[PDB]
Design a protein around this ligand. Sequence first.
Ligand SMILES: [Mg+2]
Ligand SMILES: [Mg+2]
Ligand SMILES: [Mg+2]
Ligand SMILES: [Mg+2]
Ligand SMILES: [Mg+2]
Ligand SMILES: [Mg+2]
Ligand SMILES: [Mg+2]
Ligand SMILES: [Mg+2]
Ligand SMILES: [Mg+2]
Ligand SMILES: [Mg+2]
Ligand SMILES: [Mg+2]
Ligand SMILES: [Mg+2]
Ligand SMILES: [Mg+2]
Ligand SMILES: [Mg+2]
Ligand SMILES: [Mg+2]
Ligand SMILES: [Mg+2]
Ligand SMILES: [Mg+2]
Ligand SMILES: [Mg+2]
Ligand SMILES: [Mg+2]
Ligand SMILES: [Mg+2]
Ligand SMILES: [Mg+2]
Ligand SMILES: [Mg+2]
Ligand SMILES: [Mg+2]
Ligand SMILES: [Mg+2]
Ligand SMILES: [Mg+2]
Ligand SMILES: [Mg+2]
Ligand SMILES: [Mg+2]
Ligand SMILES: [Mg+2]
Ligand SMILES: [Mg+2]
Ligand SMILES: [Mg+2]
Ligand SMILES: [Mg+2]
Ligand SMILES: [Mg+2]
Ligand SMILES: [Mg+2]
Ligand SMILES: [Mg+2]
Ligand SMILES: [Mg+2]
Ligand SMILES: [Mg+2]
Ligand SMILES: [Mg+2]
Ligand SMILES: [Mg+2]
Ligand SMILES: [Mg+2]
Ligand SMILES: [Mg+2]
Ligand SMILES: [Mg+2]
Ligand SMILES: [Mg+2]
Ligand SMILES: [Mg+2]
Ligand SMILES: [Mg+2]
Ligand SMILES: [Mg+2]
Ligand SMILES: [Mg+2]
Ligand SMILES: [Mg+2]
Ligand SMILES: [Mg+2]
Ligand SMILES: [Mg+2]
Ligand SMILES: [Mg+2]
Ligand SMILES: [Mg+2]
Ligand SMILES: [Mg+2]
Ligand SMILES: [Mg+2]
Ligand SMILES: [Mg+2]
Ligand SMILES: [Mg+2]
Ligand SMILES: [Mg+2]
Ligand SMILES: [Mg+2]
Ligand SMILES: [Mg+2]
Ligand SMILES: [Mg+2]
Ligand SMILES: [Mg+2]
Ligand SMILES: [Mg+2]
Ligand SMILES: [Mg+2]
Ligand SMILES: [Mg+2]
Ligand SMILES: [Mg+2]
Ligand SMILES: [Mg+2]
Ligand SMILES: [Mg+2]
Ligand SMILES: [Mg+2]
Ligand SMILES: [Mg+2]
Ligand SMILES: [Mg+2]
Ligand SMILES: [Mg+2]
Ligand SMILES: [Mg+2]
Ligand SMILES: [Mg+2]
Ligand SMILES: [Mg+2]
Ligand SMILES: [Mg+2]
Ligand SMILES: [Mg+2]
Ligand SMILES: [Mg+2]
Ligand SMILES: [Mg+2]
Ligand SMILES: [Mg+2]
Ligand SMILES: [Mg+2]
Ligand SMILES: [Mg+2]
Ligand SMILES: [Mg+2]
Ligand SMILES: [Mg+2]
Ligand SMILES: [Mg+2]
Ligand SMILES: [Mg+2]
Ligand SMILES: [Mg+2]
Ligand SMILES: [Mg+2]
Ligand SMILES: [Mg+2]
Ligand SMILES: [Mg+2]
Ligand SMILES: [Mg+2]
Ligand SMILES: [Mg+2]
Ligand SMILES: [Mg+2]
Ligand SMILES: [Mg+2]
Ligand SMILES: [Mg+2]
Ligand SMILES: [Mg+2]
Ligand SMILES: [Mg+2]
Ligand SMILES: [Mg+2]
Ligand SMILES: [Mg+2]
Ligand SMILES: [Mg+2]
Ligand SMILES: [Mg+2]
Ligand SMILES: [Mg+2]
Ligand SMILES: [Mg+2]
Ligand SMILES: [Mg+2]
Ligand SMILES: [Mg+2]
Ligand SMILES: [Mg+2]
Ligand SMILES: [Mg+2]
Ligand SMILES: [Mg+2]
Ligand SMILES: [Mg+2]
Ligand SMILES: [Mg+2]
Ligand SMILES: [Mg+2]
Ligand SMILES: [Mg+2]
Ligand SMILES: [Mg+2]
Ligand SMILES: [Zn+2]
Lengths: 112, 101, 140, 154, 59, 116
Amino acid sequence: MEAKAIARYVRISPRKVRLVVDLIRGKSLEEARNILRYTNKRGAYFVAKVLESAAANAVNNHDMLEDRLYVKAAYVDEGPALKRVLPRARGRADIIKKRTSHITVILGEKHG
Amino acid sequence: MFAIVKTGGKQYRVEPGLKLRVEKLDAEPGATVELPVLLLGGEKTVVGTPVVEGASVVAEVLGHGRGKKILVSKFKAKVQYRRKKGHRQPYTELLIKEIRG
Amino acid sequence: MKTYVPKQVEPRWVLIDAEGKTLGRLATKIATLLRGKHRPDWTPNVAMGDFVVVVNADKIRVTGKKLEQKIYTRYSGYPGGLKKIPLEKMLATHPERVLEHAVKGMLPKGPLGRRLFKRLKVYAGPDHPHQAQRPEKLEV
Amino acid sequence: RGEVAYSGRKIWPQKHTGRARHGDIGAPIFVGGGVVFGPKPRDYSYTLPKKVRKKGLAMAVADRAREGKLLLVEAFAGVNGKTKEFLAWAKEAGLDGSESVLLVTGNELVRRAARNLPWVVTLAPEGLNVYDIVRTERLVMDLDAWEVFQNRIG
Amino acid sequence: AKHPVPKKKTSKARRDARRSHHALTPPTLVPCPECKAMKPPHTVCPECGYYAGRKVLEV
Amino acid sequence: PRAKTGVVRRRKHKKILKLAKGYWGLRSKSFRKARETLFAAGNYAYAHRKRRKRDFRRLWIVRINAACRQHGLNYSTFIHGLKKAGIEVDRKNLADLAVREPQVFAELVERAKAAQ
RNA sequence: CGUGAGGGAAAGGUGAAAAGAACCCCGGGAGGGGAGUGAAAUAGAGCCUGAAACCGUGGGCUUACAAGCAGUCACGGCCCCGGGGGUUGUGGCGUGCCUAUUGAAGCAUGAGCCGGCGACUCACGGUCGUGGGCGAGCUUAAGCCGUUGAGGCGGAGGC
RNA sequence: GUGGAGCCUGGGAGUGAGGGCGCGAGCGAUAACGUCCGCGUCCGAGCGCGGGAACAACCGAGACCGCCAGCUAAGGCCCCC
RNA sequence: GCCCCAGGCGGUAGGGGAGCGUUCCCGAUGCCGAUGAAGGCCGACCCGCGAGGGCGGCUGGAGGUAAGGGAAGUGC
Ligand SMILES: [Mg+2]
Ligand SMILES: [Mg+2]
Ligand SMILES: [Mg+2]
Ligand SMILES: [Mg+2]
Ligand SMILES: [Mg+2]
Ligand SMILES: [Mg+2]
Ligand SMILES: [Mg+2]
Ligand SMILES: [Mg+2]
Ligand SMILES: [Mg+2]
Ligand SMILES: [Mg+2]
Ligand SMILES: [Mg+2]
Ligand SMILES: [Mg+2]
Ligand SMILES: [Mg+2]
Ligand SMILES: [Mg+2]
Ligand SMILES: [Mg+2]
Ligand SMILES: [Mg+2]
Ligand SMILES: [Mg+2]
Ligand SMILES: [Mg+2]
Ligand SMILES: [Mg+2]
Ligand SMILES: [Mg+2]
Ligand SMILES: [Mg+2]
Ligand SMILES: [Mg+2]
Ligand SMILES: [Mg+2]
Ligand SMILES: [Mg+2]
Ligand SMILES: [Mg+2]
Ligand SMILES: [Mg+2]
Ligand SMILES: [Mg+2]
Ligand SMILES: [Mg+2]
Ligand SMILES: [Mg+2]
Ligand SMILES: [Mg+2]
Ligand SMILES: [Mg+2]
Ligand SMILES: [Mg+2]
Ligand SMILES: [Mg+2]
Ligand SMILES: [Mg+2]
Ligand SMILES: [Mg+2]
Ligand SMILES: [Mg+2]
Ligand SMILES: [Mg+2]
Ligand SMILES: [Mg+2]
Ligand SMILES: [Mg+2]
Ligand SMILES: [Mg+2]
Ligand SMILES: [Mg+2]
Ligand SMILES: [Mg+2]
Ligand SMILES: [Mg+2]
Ligand SMILES: [Mg+2]
Ligand SMILES: [Mg+2]
Ligand SMILES: [Mg+2]
Ligand SMILES: [Mg+2]
Ligand SMILES: [Mg+2]
Ligand SMILES: [Mg+2]
Ligand SMILES: [Mg+2]
Ligand SMILES: [Mg+2]
Ligand SMILES: [Mg+2]
Ligand SMILES: [Mg+2]
Ligand SMILES: [Mg+2]
Ligand SMILES: [Mg+2]
Ligand SMILES: [Mg+2]
Ligand SMILES: [Mg+2]
Ligand SMILES: [Mg+2]
Ligand SMILES: [Mg+2]
Ligand SMILES: [Mg+2]
Ligand SMILES: [Mg+2]
Ligand SMILES: [Mg+2]
Ligand SMILES: [Mg+2]
Ligand SMILES: [Mg+2]
Ligand SMILES: [Mg+2]
Ligand SMILES: [Mg+2]
Ligand SMILES: [Mg+2]
Ligand SMILES: [Mg+2]
Ligand SMILES: [Mg+2]
Ligand SMILES: [Mg+2]
Ligand SMILES: [Mg+2]
Ligand SMILES: [Mg+2]
Ligand SMILES: [Mg+2]
Ligand SMILES: [Mg+2]
Ligand SMILES: [Mg+2]
Ligand SMILES: [Mg+2]
Ligand SMILES: [Mg+2]
Ligand SMILES: [Mg+2]
Ligand SMILES: [Mg+2]
Ligand SMILES: [Mg+2]
Ligand SMILES: [Mg+2]
Ligand SMILES: [Mg+2]
Ligand SMILES: [Mg+2]
Ligand SMILES: [Mg+2]
Ligand SMILES: [Mg+2]
Ligand SMILES: [Mg+2]
Ligand SMILES: [Mg+2]
Ligand SMILES: [Mg+2]
Ligand SMILES: [Mg+2]
Ligand SMILES: [Mg+2]
Ligand SMILES: [Mg+2]
Ligand SMILES: [Mg+2]
Ligand SMILES: [Mg+2]
Ligand SMILES: [Mg+2]
Ligand SMILES: [Mg+2]
Ligand SMILES: [Mg+2]
Ligand SMILES: [Mg+2]
Ligand SMILES: [Mg+2]
Ligand SMILES: [Mg+2]
Ligand SMILES: [Mg+2]
Ligand SMILES: [Mg+2]
Ligand SMILES: [Mg+2]
Ligand SMILES: [Mg+2]
Ligand SMILES: [Mg+2]
Ligand SMILES: [Mg+2]
Ligand SMILES: [Mg+2]
Ligand SMILES: [Mg+2]
Ligand SMILES: [Mg+2]
Ligand SMILES: [Mg+2]
Ligand SMILES: [Mg+2]
Ligand SMILES: [Mg+2]
Ligand SMILES: [Zn+2]
């Protein structure tokens, strides 16, 4: 059995959070929880809520044991972008892209 | 035993039981064809000069086919010259049966 | 009927005495051996030549004034880093490199011709430390 | 590009802006701009030679006759402007509904009785055209339509 | 100066190659001998407030 | 009527891009770069079919010369001998003999030496 | 947007029906996971279809002594389907595309990439070819009648 | 001499920046990858192929396609080859 | 008298020829279509010298449209 959680339209640039999600891919839920708590990244806060929601979905919804849960698969997808004007010198206006992430975490069960 | 035949402007070593594709033959499927023999090997090393005297091999015709397509394409730069041609070279499939050595 | 492609073999080891021989005309025969072109089953894309061991490199000879007029060259990459080493000075200091640099320059460029050159074992003095290989002698 | 809603103002200067050069956004190179050589109101009608028309008219029925498909009638018996009354007359005429019919008659009630039929083309005799002959399989002509027929091909 | 500028777009191959060094390291964490909770070493445990055996922090 | 592009350009680009699968970078991903790669691909293909013929002939000649020098002559004299010896076995098979059947080949070296 | 005259956008689609997801679960929320609705929920409202560039996750082959318009030809290795397909180790060979030019791989122009828009047409004449009609003749133009996608009349006039 | 010969009439053009080379001259300095004519050639349009290390026009040769067959051309045949 | 023999087939400006595809019309009150239209994705199979066409699997869920001709906002 697998259990998943998705955080969509999270207003953090994907490339940044992918750094965090890379730290937990394959880790045990316990190892992943401890990683994020002291991962000095804004991403950690978001990747954490996904992990716990995924953890919760496995226990309540999907007949899975919290002590056997590991991050089977995880990835950040790019949502739409919040395009914003950045005033530059000499009357030029840049377009800043405030990017967005679709954060997914799939938990499996480490059998043994 | 083995021999080296001539067929379709190309020489091939042949042994009995062999499947070999050569140029299209003007023969029917099922029928047999008497190929030349330029040399016999195995035991009797008979070196034709150029063909052996009266020895042949006996190839049964397995059927005819065309080769897998070849996209012959030509291109010249700065001249707008592009050619795209498809090519399926036809072939006759042979089963060698005997080596009348 | 398709052309024969040799499944691998173990390489044949060969000993050659560079005593008295001429540099280019021995480098020729080593190259051929290194390519493996003396074998009738030669394949251009595989290292299947012979392992050529040379001895008495110091004793190799050259015609004309090439002892002191032929100048080897290295470019260090820095300004004025063009080194100039006449053959005399080469044999004086690193003699085995003469035939080595002649066999290499007659080997094809590319990854294979670099491995083929690694099958070259040039030594000055009659001894070579390749006894475990059983090197045939070749009179060339 | 002239008939389009935009202004004629040159969108930006000709040189030194690093952009491609442009005039008005009405130009056909612009998304939303004018069309190049697109359709305009047009008269497709031409005066095909009157003789060719006649000969076509003559030859089209001439074809129908050759197949044994031209049929002439004296009147339409049990009909009075009711469709089933035409089904009667047609069935007893050899017209079953397996063949299309260009029914050419000046009888207003007979055209009225037969026109809603899918396999029938109502026609007045003055209407005999060659496209409608070819359209259908069967030609069925009240002799008065045959009257005005010959007097037009003459 | 005269406004240097990228001559060619960087391939996906060479961009990600530049990022072959951007992976984060996991934080160094050791179990707290009191409450057995994982914490960065040489920090006062923010769970039980104990550092060096003694109670430092009122958590 | 208006005949918009519709599906036509997408289907054209896909056929090229499919023929461009396996290519490095945009050469398989960008239609424009795929077309340029496929232009040289087809010219190489054709020019190499003409050249593959020379390449295997070069391979047979060397293999023959190597078997011929095993028997005291060279390729050039071996071919002159066969010429006069009336033997017309092609190099694709002379070289195949030299590997698989070196006794039939030794026979051919004999016939060649004798023809001159 | 412009002081103003004036310029001047973008932006359509759930489903048959809101039946538009009660309740519960993680979460401050957003979002998600169960449940439920529905023929369909990668029809879930950021809604039909959902290409391409573009960004990821996973798997196969491959790669850290190697020289390259990126391909191609050959052999070989590995993986896959039951001779193919995928991958590329070595060997050979190999000067992007377009434009403009006497001559460009050219260190001469254009192009970041992708998708869609994007350029020889129409009218009336003229000229020649042509497919038919009629032929020392051929043809009507307005308009008139009819039809409501029916054609016919009309000889003024033209050649 | 039956040839993608020619002639006659029409329809459609494009081109009217050429360039290198050999030869014959002018100009130039018995200079220029010079310039200007003439004859020829190739490139242009054969930046397709073999040679000339590489290289439009020098040498060889006019690429319908396919072959893991054969003879040659220039050039080559000690090794790269 | 569909086969056989021989010959030609480098090409820019350009001339001519033969085809493919796109939108729309006649065919069509027809035919195909919820046992799945158009479109999309994939295919190493089939037909074609090629532009292409078919067939098969998947997606799609409501349109499409032959033979044979016609007309163009027709192919980047
Ligand atoms: Mg972060
Ligand atoms: Mg839990
Ligand atoms: Mg300002
Ligand atoms: Mg940007
Ligand atoms: Mg950005
Ligand atoms: Mg951002
Ligand atoms: Mg074959
Ligand atoms: Mg054949
Ligand atoms: Mg080009
Ligand atoms: Mg080129
Ligand atoms: Mg050119
Ligand atoms: Mg071109
Ligand atoms: Mg052209
Ligand atoms: Mg100096
Ligand atoms: Mg305008
Ligand atoms: Mg205007
Ligand atoms: Mg306006
Ligand atoms: Mg206007
Ligand atoms: Mg103005
Ligand atoms: Mg710019
Ligand atoms: Mg404009
Ligand atoms: Mg408009
Ligand atoms: Mg007209
Ligand atoms: Mg008119
Ligand atoms: Mg009707
Ligand atoms: Mg300054
Ligand atoms: Mg860049
Ligand atoms: Mg990558
Ligand atoms: Mg990556
Ligand atoms: Mg278009
Ligand atoms: Mg050849
Ligand atoms: Mg053997
Ligand atoms: Mg304002
Ligand atoms: Mg204002
Ligand atoms: Mg609706
Ligand atoms: Mg709550
Ligand atoms: Mg909620
Ligand atoms: Mg939900
Ligand atoms: Mg249900
Ligand atoms: Mg259903
Ligand atoms: Mg369905
Ligand atoms: Mg759901
Ligand atoms: Mg779907
Ligand atoms: Mg759907
Ligand atoms: Mg939302
Ligand atoms: Mg939408
Ligand atoms: Mg719908
Ligand atoms: Mg989508
Ligand atoms: Mg996509
Ligand atoms: Mg990957
Ligand atoms: Mg090295
Ligand atoms: Mg290596
Ligand atoms: Mg490499
Ligand atoms: Mg290669
Ligand atoms: Mg220019
Ligand atoms: Mg210029
Ligand atoms: Mg450049
Ligand atoms: Mg410039
Ligand atoms: Mg430039
Ligand atoms: Mg450029
Ligand atoms: Mg210019
Ligand atoms: Mg350009
Ligand atoms: Mg730009
Ligand atoms: Mg485009
Ligand atoms: Mg025109
Ligand atoms: Mg016109
Ligand atoms: Mg005209
Ligand atoms: Mg005319
Ligand atoms: Mg007549
Ligand atoms: Mg008249
Ligand atoms: Mg001519
Ligand atoms: Mg003319
Ligand atoms: Mg001109
Ligand atoms: Mg002029
Ligand atoms: Mg001039
Ligand atoms: Mg001039
Ligand atoms: Mg000229
Ligand atoms: Mg001139
Ligand atoms: Mg000049
Ligand atoms: Mg000239
Ligand atoms: Mg001379
Ligand atoms: Mg002088
Ligand atoms: Mg001169
Ligand atoms: Mg030109
Ligand atoms: Mg020419
Ligand atoms: Mg040339
Ligand atoms: Mg020429
Ligand atoms: Mg050359
Ligand atoms: Mg050049
Ligand atoms: Mg050349
Ligand atoms: Mg030719
Ligand atoms: Mg010969
Ligand atoms: Mg010669
Ligand atoms: Mg040479
Ligand atoms: Mg050699
Ligand atoms: Mg020609
Ligand atoms: Mg041609
Ligand atoms: Mg068409
Ligand atoms: Mg439409
Ligand atoms: Mg209809
Ligand atoms: Mg109906
Ligand atoms: Mg189906
Ligand atoms: Mg359509
Ligand atoms: Mg297809
Ligand atoms: Mg068709
Ligand atoms: Mg399908
Ligand atoms: Mg479909
Ligand atoms: Mg269709
Ligand atoms: Mg239709
Ligand atoms: Mg257009
Ligand atoms: Mg197109
Ligand atoms: Zn503690």
